[PDB]
Design an enzyme around this catalytic site. Structure first.
Site, PDB file in Angstrom:
ATOM      1  N   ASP A   1     -90.669  64.641 -40.458  1.00 38.28           N
ATOM      2  CA  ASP A   1     -89.651  63.616 -40.238  1.00 38.28           C
ATOM      3  C   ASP A   1     -90.278  62.421 -39.526  1.00 38.28           C
ATOM      4  O   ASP A   1     -90.426  62.433 -38.298  1.00 38.28           O
ATOM      5  CB  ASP A   1     -88.522  64.202 -39.402  1.00 38.28           C
TER       6      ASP A   1
ATOM      7  N   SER B   1     -88.929  44.597 -45.201  1.00 37.81           N
ATOM      8  CA  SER B   1     -89.069  44.367 -46.622  1.00 37.81           C
ATOM      9  C   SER B   1     -88.794  42.906 -46.941  1.00 37.81           C
ATOM     10  O   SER B   1     -87.999  42.241 -46.273  1.00 37.81           O
ATOM     11  CB  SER B   1     -88.090  45.271 -47.367  1.00 37.81           C
TER      12      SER B   1
END
Length: 330
Positions: A35, A199
């Site tokens: 994770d 992004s």
């Protein structure tokens, strides 16, 4: 040193991935959920409330000659999905794919919430976010990657998750045969303890790319792709009959649909998520309403590039002095 381990979807939907991890002496192999959105290595154990164990493999520290109680240390964690676990702490030897760390904090669960009990395939979590998020008190502990870093050939790990197939986590090296083209690296902020990046935009299907900054986290422990409501609405508007359902808890779409791809930007590069990766199947057994793999982050507080996005790429988690992330197509 290096390590290399195969990671395998837990079910036919890629709801999560499990990776075998050796703990203790002699080794006890547990299948952990790696994770990159959390920083605790915790396991089902001989100390876990018996009624909260239902099929998981347990770590038994009393059977490990290298286990040592970390005196006074406790841990307690809550995840974005509302699940939680807590317990005490041992140090022990932990190996992943041939890479060994001695003295790793192994957090032994005394209590786990129902969603963990109900998932017999996940024996615990191995956190790979920054150690500043580790919950052990009163002495915070380091992640497996942080402990291994100095010994690694290169201070990196990579995630290569499969679509409906096994993939690989590598530590200490970048397998140049595992991706196509080049790796595009992008800046990371560690201020929230995550692999947080920005992004450069998105496209829906064959549509034009929209240049827009989307701050989010690379999180292998989250199944889906959670993005701003504007972006998610633009995606699902291209799917006839798709709608946001408050009763189901997100966007659903007719199972008869063919989904468009979704592209996200990494600098000037582009990662394409095929439409099939966005199908999470019937909302309930036999339903013709299917659950979408792109959902709004509006109620989260952060955008999350979870498995739906990451499995479309070869992802480098660069733990150099200034961390960065790298993405390549594959």
């Amino acid at each position: 040193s290096t390590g290399s381990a195969t990671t395998t979807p837990i079910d036919s939907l890629d709801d999560a991935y499990i990776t075998p991890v050796q703990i203790g002496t002699p080794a006890q192999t547990l299948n952990l959920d790696f994770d990159t959105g959390s920083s605790d290595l915790w396991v089902f154990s001989s100390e876990t409330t018996a009624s909260e164990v239902d099929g998981q493999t347990i770590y038994t520290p009393s059977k490990s000659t290298t286990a040592k109680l970390l005196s006074g240390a406790t841990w307690s964690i809550s995840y974005g999905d509302g699940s939680s676990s807590s317990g005490d702490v041992y140090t022990d030897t932990v190996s992943v794919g041939g890479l060994t760390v001695t003295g790793q904090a192994v957090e032994s669960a005394k209590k786990v919430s129902s969603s963990f009990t109900e998932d017999s395939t996940i024996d615990g979590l191995l956190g790979l976010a920054f150690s500043t998020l580790n919950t052990v008190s009163p002495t915070q502990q380091k992640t497996f990657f942080d402990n291994a870093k100095a010994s690694l050939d290169s201070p990196v790990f990579t995630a290569d998750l499969g679509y409906h197939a096994p993939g690989t986590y590598n530590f200490g090296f970048i397998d140049t045969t595992a991706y196509t083209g080049s790796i595009t690296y992008t800046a990371v902020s560690t201020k929230q303890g995550f692999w947080e990046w920005t992004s450069t935009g998105y496209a829906v299907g064959s549509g034009t790319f929209k240049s827009t900054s989307i701050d989010g986290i690379a999180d292998t422990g989250t199944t889906l792709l959670y993005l701003p409501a504007t972006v998610v609405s633009a995606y699902w508007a291209q799917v006839s009959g798709a709608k946001s359902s408050s009763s189901v808890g997100g966007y659903v779409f007719p199972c008869s649909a063919t989904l468009p791809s979704f592209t996200f930007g990494v600098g000037s590069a582009r990662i394409v998520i095929p439409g099939d990766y966005i199908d999470f199947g019937p909302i309930s057994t036999g339903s013709s309403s299917c659950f979408g793999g792109i959902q709004s982050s509006a109620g989260i507080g952060i955008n999350i590039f979870g498995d739906v996005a990451l499995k479309a790429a070869f992802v480098v988690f660069n733990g150099a002095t200034t961390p960065t992330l790298g993405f390549a197509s594959k």
